[PDB]
Amino acid sequence: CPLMVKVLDAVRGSPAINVAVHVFRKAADDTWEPFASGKTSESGELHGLTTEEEFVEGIYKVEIDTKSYWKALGISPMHEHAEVVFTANDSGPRRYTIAAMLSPYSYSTTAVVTN
Amino acid sequence: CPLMVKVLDAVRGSPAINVAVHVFRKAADDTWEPFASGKTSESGELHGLTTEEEFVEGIYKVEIDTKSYWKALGISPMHEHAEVVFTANDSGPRRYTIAAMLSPYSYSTTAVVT
Amino acid sequence: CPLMVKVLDAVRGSPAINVAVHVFRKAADDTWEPFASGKTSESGELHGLTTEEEFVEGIYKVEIDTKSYWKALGISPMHEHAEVVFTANDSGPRRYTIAAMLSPYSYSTTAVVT
Amino acid sequence: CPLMVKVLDAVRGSPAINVAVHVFRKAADDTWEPFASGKTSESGELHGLTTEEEFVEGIYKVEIDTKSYWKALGISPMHEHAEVVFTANDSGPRRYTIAAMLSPYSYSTTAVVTN
């Protein structure tokens, strides 16, 4: 499993469950073409987005629908979403985990890369 | 000053100076309309981007050229840039301080609203 | 001002006002020597804690009474209080801004050094 | 396993491996008594710190030696450690995961509490 996203609710101290996640890859021109999508599970994790065969080198965009997450709890948050754009597998295939920590008025998204 | 953007360097622990920041506002037709842009000062802050009259209710995108920042420090980052999209003034005028803390593999952002 | 502490509320997106802050410095015998204290203002900032003459090299602890802050807001937090411990001025005097962002279950802290 | 700590290096984008972690519990007096300790694995996680029987109600402090971590990588750190003090099991037994994200000049620690 080369790409996984883990989302945590730092305000309620719990996993961010059922959060929509969309992944895109930049095509040769300059457009973002749909690559994969899914929703986080009860543990706040999202596995199986793609495979080693499909996940080639490229610039990828991971957009987390944090707004719907907060609205469902009755909160109108600051951000429309949490997004990370990064280059993947530029020095060979790696396993990537996008770890996102959420709060209504702030968030962090970091790319954890392993061999 | 209703909108101020601050950028910090998580690796060196200093203000990220001379960083390019672009701000866009989403139009009725769903497109991104250029709003204002500038570069952070020695304190890592960007003031004067807009006015109270100009900064109406809406969805705004702040795009930081984090990549050029790292390049100039001799670093080749994994993150391509940093983008923060937020809804502003939907409950009346407010002053916003949008801060972004950078690292080659991560960014954190905060919004202080008063 | 060589040391400034700023506290923010990640739940409401505002400065955390009237937050108690206590600073200690580790003594030669390993005990925490009271150094300075105060409360955040309406901007969530606390200035004037110390001076260039008193702020010597050493290991400092900034203890933030997050608990009392939440209580006043009708919230019984799981986090008891934040402790930010750092070494200061070990390569000469520097100006430090210690910021802490709070939630009932978490806190993030940053340090800008100039 | 009621208490787990996971540490991530948000600056190098990897798990923070072999990081020492010390856990204390405030005793009836007002002092921090040793409770448990360990080192993070290659995944940056530390399991088996305590048991359901031993982890009773109380105020606990979890101190992560980030200073040694950054030095071993040749990176000068700002903080002595990343820490979290919290009341645990005050409303019955819970599972606690301390998620800490690290950078030389900043850290975040959030208690993820589940049933």
Q: Return d(Cα D113, Cα D94) in angstroms, integer.
A: 6
Q: Which of B105, B60, B64 shows the shortest CA–CA distance to B81?
A: B64
Q: CB neighbours (10 Å) of residue C91?
A: 8
The per-residue DSSP string of A4-23 comes to EEEEEETTTTEE-TT-EEEE
- Chains touching chain B through at least 3 C-beta pairs below 8 angstroms are A, C, D
Annotated binding residue at C33? Answer: no
Q: Where are the alpha helices (DSSP H) in chain B?
A: 66-71
Considering only CB atoms, C109 lies closest to which of D88, D107, D113, namely D107
The upper half-sphere exposure of residue C72, i.e. CA atoms within 13 Å in the direction of its Cβ, equals 10
Using a CB-CB distance cutoff of 8 angstroms, which residues of chain A are in contact with residue B103?
A: 110
SS3 content of chain D, % helix, strand, coil (to 5): 5, 55, 40
Contact (CB<8Å) D86/C79: yes
Domain that holds residue A41: 1-115
CATH code at position C99: 2.60.40.180
Q: Would you state the structure tokens that stand for residue C47, as one six-digit string?
A: 């200035």
Q: Would you state the structure tokens that stand for residue B75, as one six-digit string?
A: 């670093």
The upper half-sphere exposure of residue A61, i.e. CA atoms within 13 Å in the direction of its Cβ, equals 17
Contact (CB<8Å) A76/B90: yes
Lookup result for tokens 């929703």: A39
Q: Would you state the structure tokens that stand for residue D60, as one six-digit string?
A: 């606990």
Q: Which of D48, B84, C106 shows the shortest CA–CA distance to A102?
A: C106
Q: Return d(Cα A67, Cα D83) in angstroms, integer.
A: 30
**Type of residue at B22:** H
Q: Return d(Cα A97, Cα A99) in angstroms, integer.
A: 6
Query: Residue D48 pairs with which residues in a beta bridge?
Result: none
Q: Would you state the structure tokens that stand for residue D115, as one six-digit string?
A: 């049933």
Residue A90 is classified by DSSP as: B
Q: Would you state the structure tokens that stand for residue D25, as one six-digit string?
A: 């519990």
Q: Whats the size of chain C, residue-wise? A: 114
Q: Whats the size of chain D, residue-wise? A: 115
Q: Return d(Cα A109, Cα B9) in angstroms, integer.
A: 15
- Name the domain count of chain A: 1
Instruction: Provide the terminal-to-terminal Cα distance of chain A, rounded to the nearest Å.
Output: 11
**How many contacts does A have with D, using Cβ atoms within 8 A?**
36
Q: CB neighbours (10 Å) of residue C12?
A: 14
Contact (CB<8Å) B10/D12: no
Q: Is A59 helix (H, G, I), strand (E, B) or coil?
A: strand
Q: Return d(Cα B20, Cα B33) in angstroms, integer.
A: 17
Instruction: Provide the terminal-to-terminal Cα distance of chain D, rounded to the nearest Å.
Output: 12
Evaluate whether B92 touches B98 at the Cβ level (below 8 Å): no
**How many contacts does A have with C, using Cβ atoms within 8 A?**
37
Evaluate whether B58 touches B31 at the Cβ level (below 8 Å): no
Using a CB-CB distance cutoff of 8 angstroms, which residues of chain B are in contact with residue D108?
A: 108
Strands A95-103 and A3-9: parallel
Evaluate whether C46 touches C39 at the Cβ level (below 8 Å): yes
Q: Is B19 helix (H, G, I), strand (E, B) or coil?
A: coil
Q: CB neighbours (10 Å) of residue A57?
A: 13
Q: Return d(Cα B108, Cα C8) in angstroms, integer.
A: 14
Q: Return d(Cα D62, Cα D39) in angstroms, integer.
A: 12
The resolution, in Å, is 2.1
Q: Return d(Cα C93, Cα C96) in angstroms, integer.
A: 10
Q: Would you state the structure tokens that stand for residue D98, as one six-digit string?
A: 């301390």
Binding-site residues of A for L-thyroxine: 6, 45, 108
Q: CB neighbours (10 Å) of residue D28?
A: 7
Annotated binding residue at B53? Answer: no
Q: Return d(Cα A99, Cα D102) in angstroms, integer.
A: 12
Q: Return d(Cα A47, Cα C22) in angstroms, integer.
A: 44
Q: Would you state the structure tokens that stand for residue D35, as one six-digit string?
A: 């409770």
Q: Return d(Cα B59, Cα B55) in angstroms, integer.
A: 11
Q: With the C-alpha atoms ordered D69, D100, C81, C10, is the resulting torsion angle positive or negative?
A: positive
Q: Return d(Cα A84, Cα A110) in angstroms, integer.
A: 8
Provide the experimental method for this PDB entry: X-ray
Task: For residue B30, give Cα distances in angstroms to A35, B26, B59.
Answer: 22, 6, 10
Q: What does the radius of gyration of chain D's CA atoms come to, in whole angstroms? A: 14
